[PDB]
Ligand binder design. Structure first.
Ligand SMILES: [Cl-]
Ligand SMILES: [Cl-]
Ligand SMILES: [Cl-]
Ligand SMILES: [Cl-]
Ligand SMILES: [Cl-]
Ligand SMILES: [Cl-]
Ligand SMILES: [Cl-]
Ligand code: NA
Length: 129
């Protein structure tokens, strides 16, 4: 599914991400924008053989099992395919663990380089919610 900007904001809020670990909804929308362009089915291979999955591009090196990332962990206890669903529940639950892990939203390199410190409220501007 390719979400609309407000549609995703609404789904994120419904799944309790709005202000989770102090990160406003616009942070999460901005992260999803630059990670996946709002496409639940986004996958991208990393140089090291791991793969990033879904709306928030969660990496198989740590967080999910794809069966082809030697030496990786699966800390969200989920197949990486579950992170590609049109329903964002699994991606949200896993993102919640990632953002609690110590470095906050810096875990998402696109959030660090493209969202951090910016006017992230623009991402939810005009959304009913
Ligand atoms: Cl947009
Ligand atoms: Cl915001
Ligand atoms: Cl693996
Ligand atoms: Cl699995
Ligand atoms: Cl959803
Ligand atoms: Cl933080
Ligand atoms: Cl709206
Ligand atoms: Na893994």
């Amino acid at each position: 599914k390719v979400f609309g900007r407000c549609e995703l904001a609404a789904a994120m809020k419904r799944h309790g991400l709005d202000n989770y670990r102090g990160y406003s909804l616009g942070n999460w929308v901005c992260a999803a924008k630059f990670e996946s362009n709002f496409n639940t089915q986004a996958t991208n291979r990393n140089t090291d053989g791991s793969t990033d999955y879904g709306i928030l591009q969660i990496n198989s090196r740590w967080w999910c099992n794809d069966g082809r990332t030697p030496g990786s962990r699966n800390l969200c206890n989920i197949p990486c395919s579950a992170l590609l669903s049109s329903d964002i529940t699994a991606s949200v639950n896993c993102a919640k663990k990632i953002v609690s892990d110590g470095n906050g939203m810096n875990a998402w390199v696109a959030w660090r380089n493209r969202c951090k410190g910016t006017d992230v409220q623009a991402w939810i501007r005009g959304c009913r919610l």
